[PDB]
């Protein structure tokens, strides 16, 4: 028996198949349930590899009624709900034609309405090809400073829907600009680059340049290898 | 120019066609090689491990193409100058049967199993194989089809036409996906990956073509004038293979770079690449088959393993 | 129509059952279609 | 000959072989060697970079995470068998840590196993080579 | 810096990396970098004893055994791999040979199943 079968790596769960009999289990749009293409991707697997597959869902709370007020208050306020990433708007040049934008985050975390179904196909998207989602990182995306959010969208047509459709996201954060004196008393006793590198390599310049940290790349689960990343 | 290219002692015996060699392909196995000749026109099956000709058998007519449809020798279709398409079996000849118009060029989907005629015809012939009735036609419009060939990764038809455009066709639902626009005509046209595409043209031009973008990514121009038959990929250094009579050329898929040309003694026919190895395999016209093996471009195959040694 | 010059549906008989469909597509039929509606210009 | 043929072969199928028993092979007291000559200024430079030799010595300093002089250690280890070095004064059980780790490449809790000394006690022994080492290092360094 | 760091590190806990991944590593950018002196007369002696060139060369001839001149392949394998000794035009195949069992100390055997090639095709591919 693999309890939380999604959480571990898809190569490992080959072998623990065998030709014995398995019984597996996954989570899905939970507090620490795996994302949607690491999910298709097992399930996938499953499928491929006389066995006789078997598929059981459970959509009843074991604790409250379901349809519980607090439980939608508090999955949509941190994001713990994947849903379809976003609806396939029609294919885009890859290389040629898409153009990043700037998200605010000060618009993007108040509590419109147009607001926050971009802030859900965004979670979502964020989450995808994440083994185990923390609601730590919404709270660390939100109020943490410098973390910088960038979109591409398909090149936009004189009309156009409320929201856009959005192909990959990625999150920069910025570092460095540390003081000389300041990295000697590490060295002796803002990221993980500028304090890794100028210990291994014992340098004290550098730490006083500035720089970024791609700290996440994300595309959506269809589009996946095609020329967004 | 550092790529010192070898020429071949008799790794295979009396692999000797008695005038000139049409057409030379390989196994999906690599168990077995297929070649095809005037005179008295003859298909020969050369066991690699035996390092010897399995069989010979002659035929009615002169063969432009043929296809291996079973993973081993077992089933071959031929297409015949005198519209006769030839079926062999493990045995030998097991059916033949006519095209209404003459034949350039033939591809079988797989999943299916339909098998397309693109010829002399605007319409392209399909055939279905589990049922042997014919199916129903599509028409493409154009006056002369050249060639054809079918997307292995998701299962997308293109056939050449005389004008120089591409058509695109689905071979589910049998409705035109899309058309591609690009005095010369398609000489060759293959299909490597997901999005990649690449065109020949009579006047030795070669056109790399991305499904999504109308405009070519990259243009190669072979200085002669000889149309280019024959357009294939090589995936582990990225190398995009293209053959005319004149000489073979072999570059770079992104900003065309050359890795190194072979100019033979005699014309090509048609010319082919081992898998996973560095040896090539060529068709000419001359009684004798070329063999070649380059060291640079990967290791020697398994049956030729001391090869490696010999060098 | 002669020498087969029209194309004629009978069945064939010898031809029946010659080969067994094989697939080996990656791609799914959802992500087929919104690339075949995306092709080139379109 | 054999003795050098020895070292670089520990990595080839030697590496089973416990530290001790790999120890006596290398070291005959029938037949006494002289000491090889010491390392001249163009040896060391050659053998280490600068920011190398100061990685070393600030190490010798902090001995906080034991990773980052771990790349020395083949380097430094084929000196000291090869009767070059002068001498380190380096003890039985010593001589025997830098063999496995330096020649067998062999993990430190491996070697804990092969030694049966306690691993924390091992780690305090590596600190006090390595302090023979990078102080002979500055001598040959003031020397010129 | 970290290019002969990673090379001294594969004996340690890199030896399960599978030979082209770690040769990915070392060779990056798409072009070499500035170009180092071809060995030196001086170095050559330093690192290889005149009985020990001696020993290469007759095995070059003889062809007998390779475990013979199994204790030059460490030595030898740093310095093509440091981009010294110019270039050799080794093939991929021969290139992940030579990090094999010059850095990752693994025998021709467990390479094979590595490099997939049998174990009498890796054989003349070291011996070129």
Same mark, same amino acid.
């Given at each position: ?34 994302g949607?293409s ?27 009624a ?12 941190l994001? +713990?709900? $994947? &849903? ?9 040049? @890859? %290389? /040629?034609?898409?153009?990043?934008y700037? #998200? ?8 419109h ?6 802030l ?28 910088? +959010?960038? $979109? &591409? ?9 409320? @929201? %856009? /459709? ?5 999150? #920069? ?23 890794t ?33 | ?86 079926f ?40 279905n194989?589990?049922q ?5 036609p ?59 595409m690449?065109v ?20 190669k ?91 | ?14 031809l ?19 690339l ?7 | ?14 590496s ?51 990773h ?55 780690m ?21």
């Amino acid at each position: 028996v693999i309890d939380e079968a999604a959480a571990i790596p898809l190569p490992l769960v080959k072998s623990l198949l065998g030709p014995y009999l398995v019984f597996m289990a996954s989570t899905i749009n939970g507090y620490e349930g795996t994302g949607r293409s690491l999910s298709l991707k097992l399930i996938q697997q499953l499928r491929q590899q006389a066995r006789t597959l078997y598929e059981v869902s459970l959509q009843e709370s074991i604790r409250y009624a379901p349809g519980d007020a607090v439980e939608k208050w508090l999955n949509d306020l941190l994001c +713990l709900d $994947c &849903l379809n990433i976003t609806r396939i708007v029609s294919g885009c040049p @890859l %290389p /040629e034609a898409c153009e990043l934008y700037y #998200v605010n985050r000060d618009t993007l975390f108040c509590y419109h309405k147009a607001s926050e179904v971009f802030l859900q196909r965004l979670m979502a998207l964020y989450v995808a090809s994440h083994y185990k989602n923390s609601p730590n990182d919404l709270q660390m995306l939100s109020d943490a400073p410098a973390h910088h +959010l960038f $979109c &591409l969208l398909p090149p936009v047509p004189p009309t156009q829907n409320a @929201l %856009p /459709e959005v192909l990959a996201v990625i999150q #920069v954060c910025l570092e460095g600009e540390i003081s000389r004196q300041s990295i000697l008393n590490s060295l002796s006793r803002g990221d993980l680059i500028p304090w890794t590198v100028s210990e291994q390599f014992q340098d004290p310049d550098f730490g006083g340049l500035s720089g970024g940290r791609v700290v996440r790349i994300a595309v959506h689960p269809d589009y996946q290898g095609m020329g967004y990343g | 120019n550092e790529v010192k290219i070898y020429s071949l002692i008799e790794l295979i015996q009396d692999f000797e066609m008695p005038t000139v060699c049409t057409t030379i392909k390989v196994s999906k196995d690599g168990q077995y090689i297929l070649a095809t000749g005037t005179y008295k026109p003859r298909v020969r099956c050369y066991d690699t491990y035996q390092l010897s000709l399995k069989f010979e058998r002659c035929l009615d007519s002169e063969v432009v193409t043929f296809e291996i449809l079973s993973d081993d020798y077992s089933k071959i279709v031929f297409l015949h100058n005198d519209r006769y398409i030839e079926f062999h079996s493990q045995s030998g000849f097991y059916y033949k049967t006519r095209i209404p118009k003459f034949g350039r060029d033939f591809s079988y989907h797989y999943p299916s199993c339909d098998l397309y005629f693109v010829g002399a015809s605007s319409e392209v012939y399909r055939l279905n194989l589990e049922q042997g009735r014919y199916l129903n036609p599509l028409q493409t419009d154009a006056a002369e089809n050249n060639v054809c060939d079918i997307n292995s990764v998701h299962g997308l038809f293109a056939t050449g036409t005389i004008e120089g455009r591409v058509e695109c066709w689905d071979p589910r639902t049998r409705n035109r996906v899309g058309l591609l626009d690009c005095l010369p005509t398609i000489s060759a046209l293959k299909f490597n990956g997901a999005l990649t595409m690449a065109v020949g043209t009579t006047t030795g031009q070669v056109l790399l073509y991305d499904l999504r973008s109308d405009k070519p990514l990259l243009v190669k121009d072979h200085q002669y004038g000889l149309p280019i038959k024959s357009v294939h990929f090589q995936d582990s250094l990225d190398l995009i293979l293209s053959a005319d009579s004149r000489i073979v050329k072999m570059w770079n898929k992104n900003s065309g770079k050359i890795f190194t040309s072979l100019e033979p003694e005699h014309d090509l026919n048609d010319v082919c690449l081992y898998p996973n190895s560095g040896m090539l395999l060529t068709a000419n016209e001359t009684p004798k088959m070329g063999i070649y093996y380059i060291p640079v471009l990967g290791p020697a195959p398994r049956w030729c393993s001391f090869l490696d040694n010999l060098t | 129509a002669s020498k087969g010059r029209k194309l004629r549906f009978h069945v064939l008989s010898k031809l029946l059952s010659f080969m067994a469909p094989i697939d080996h597509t990656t791609m799914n039929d959802d992500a087929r279609t919104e690339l075949y509606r995306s092709l080139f210009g379109q | 000959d054999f003795r050098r043929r020895f070292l670089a072969l520990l990595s080839y199928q030697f590496s089973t072989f416990s530290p001790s028993l790999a120890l006596n092979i290398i070291q005959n007291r029938n037949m006494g060697k002289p000491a090889q000559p010491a390392l001249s200024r163009e040896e060391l430079e050659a053998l280490f970079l600068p920011y190398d030799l100061k990685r070393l010595e600030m190490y010798s300093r902090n001995m906080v995470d034991y990773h980052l002089i771990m790349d020395m250690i083949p380097a430094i280890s084929r000196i000291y068998f090869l009767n070059q070095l002068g001498d380190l004064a380096l003890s039985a059980a010593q001589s025997a840590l830098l063999l496995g780790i330096g020649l067998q490449h062999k993990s430190v809790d491996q070697l804990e196993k092969e030694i049966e000394l306690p691993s924390g006690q091992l780690m305090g022994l590596f600190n006090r080579i390595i302090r023979k080492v990078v102080k002979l290092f500055n001598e040959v360094q003031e020397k010129a």
